[PDB]
Amino acid sequence: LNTIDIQGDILVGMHKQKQLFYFFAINDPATFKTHLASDIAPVVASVTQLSNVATQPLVALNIAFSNTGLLALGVTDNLGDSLFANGQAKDATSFKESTSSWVPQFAGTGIHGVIILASDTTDLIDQQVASIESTFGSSISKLYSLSASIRPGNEAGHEMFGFLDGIAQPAINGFNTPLPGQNIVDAGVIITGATNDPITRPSWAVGGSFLAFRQLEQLVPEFNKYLLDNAPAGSGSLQARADLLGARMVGRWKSGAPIDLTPTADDPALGADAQRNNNFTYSHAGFDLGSDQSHCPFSAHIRKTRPRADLGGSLTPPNLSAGANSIMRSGIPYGPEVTSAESASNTTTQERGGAFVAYQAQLSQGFHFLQQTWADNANFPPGKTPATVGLDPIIGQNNGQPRVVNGLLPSNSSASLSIPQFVVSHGGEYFFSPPISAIGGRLSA
């Protein structure tokens, strides 16, 4: 795996406090290509660069192109991905949402790519934007942008709902040293043209990845109040019972401890330990896999997005089922922290959420499949009792309706909750993140 040529955000992330997603159109291909090769290609951060703390740049930069952006560059080659070529807007109905609610810019194919800028101060990002806009002139044209930031203090690495994020990623066979329980996949699941990618790619695209971007707004005070109002009756404090309902929706406590390994109370020591916090398969040698929801509901978020033993394979860790449906996640929260006024009124006023970023070699096997065939599927996982699992309580969608989620209450795996959406999609786009060599090579030719 030629790490020198792979853009850093695909495999390790930017590792910076601030990020800017700068969505652009290409107006003058000739001038754009000139500065793409002379000004962008030399500064693109690779996996090798961002892997070592020594060689981290002041401003990490990555760049990806939509289908219409590649066309605008004169690239007519088949990348091998029908979903990429049609654009995420024509795919919205697969997720039971409407482009009528999207950010107007995403509701089309006018966006030609995204520059990802990453740095520890927003001042440095603002400088690089000016620099990029002044050298490209009008050949590049900003259509939309989204500023994002790691959350402050001890909430750093947590997403807006409070849960530690970035724990579970596929390990790439031959690249990562796998952690206990982590799926182990061929490189070609993430990296186009890499080991065991079955789709033929253009040679200049070998070493890239498809980037699925989603702007996902989170209603954090609403979510916090739903947990208190629907907390399961029981022993501990009401807050503790509320946290337990939230942990059952996600499949992890806010510390990162998986409920499958500690189903009744948090354990922050476990949540922080990468040698233990993923060492599970959902199988429990004394319980029936098809009906036991006392450790983790069938509808829990992580269980719907990585089913592990719900799809067969080893009942003891590591489970390796459905390695081809793995995605690498490089998202980052956006918006202000929740304010006093919102916290006291249980109502959001300031838009916040997650800039969702998923990398995969095949969009039909990754983000799109996870969203439509698993999370939005009331009968997935299969073979359960009761068979109606319900929807993913975090990301599950059903055309704006509240979503029926089963198995969340520990006292009764048949009790249903009708849960309003706490995550609201404002849309996004499918991009191709090319290998660095293509940026000043084919894409600049």
Q: Which are the catalytic amino acids?
A: 165
User: Which of 354, 407, 410, 440 is in the footprint of ligand HEM by CB under 6 A?
Assistant: 354
Residue 166 interacting with ligand HEM (CB under 6 A) = yes
Helix axes 238-250, 220-230, angle to 10 degrees: 110
Note whether 73 binds ligand HEM by CB under 6 A: no
Answer for which of 252, 295, 384, 442 binds ligand HEM (CB under 6 A) is 252
306 touching ligand HEM, by CB under 6 A: yes
CB of 271 to ligand HEM, least distance (A): 10
User: CB 428 → ligand HEM: shortest distance, Å?
Assistant: 10
Structure token pair of residue 219 = 């209603």
Sign of the dihedral through C-alpha 227, 229, 232, 235: positive
Which of 242, 394, 404, 417 binds ligand HEM (CB under 6 A)? It is 394
Applying CB under 6 A, among 47, 59, 148, 302 the residue interacting with ligand HEM is 302
Interface with ligand HEM, residue 356, by CB under 6 A: yes
- Tokens describing residue 286: 């004394």
**What distance in Å separates the CA atoms of residue 219 and residue 194, rounded to the nearest whole number?**
39
Instruction: Decide if 334 contacts 354 (C-beta within 8 A).
Output: yes
Asked if 379 and 389 touch (Cβ cutoff 8 Å), the reply is yes
Contact between 370 and ligand HEM per CB under 6 A: yes
Whole-angstrom Cα distance, residue 331 to residue 59?
A: 17
Nearest to 139 by CA among 68, 42, 40, 34: 34
From 111, 250, 363, 439, residue interacting with ligand HEM (rule: CB under 6 A): 250
CB-side exposure of 59: number of CA atoms within 13 Å? 19
Distance, CA of 417 to CA of 393 (rounded, Å): 10
Determine if 245 is a binding residue for ligand HEM (CB under 6 A).
Answer: no
Q: Tell whether 15 is in a known binding site.
A: no
159 forms part of the interface with ligand HEM (CB under 6 A): yes
Kindly tell me which of 206 and 302 has the beta carbon lying closer to ligand HEM: 302
Q: Is 423 in the site for ligand HEM (CB under 6 A)?
A: yes
Which residue of 301, 384, 403, 442 would you call a contact of ligand HEM, by CB under 6 A?
301
Helices and strands, counts by H and E, the chain: 13, 13
Contact 50, 14 (CB under 8 A): yes
The tokens for 329 are: 């996640």
Of 1-9, 14-22, 84-92, 213-221, the segment contacting ligand HEM by CB under 6 A is 213-221
Please give the helix or strand (H or E) that residue 144 lies within, else none. strand 140-149
How are beta strands 353-360 and 332-334 bridged, if at all?
antiparallel
Indicate the residue among 88 and 371 with the shorter CB distance to ligand HEM. Answer: 371
Q: Is 91 in the site for ligand HEM (CB under 6 A)?
A: no
Question: If you search the block for the tokens 């979903």, which residue do you land on?
Answer: 83
Kindly tell me which residue out of 67, 371, 406, 413 binds ligand HEM, with binding defined by CB under 6 A: 371
Phi, then psi, of 68 in degrees rounded to 5: -65, -30
Instruction: Verify binding: residue 97, ligand HEM, rule CB under 6 A.
Output: no
Size of the residue set binding ligand HEM (CB under 6 A): 27
Give the residues lining the site for ligand HEM (CB under 6 A): 159, 161, 163, 165-168, 214, 216, 218, 250, 252, 301-302, 305-306, 327, 353-354, 356, 367, 370-371, 375, 394-395, 423
Binding-site residue ranges: 301
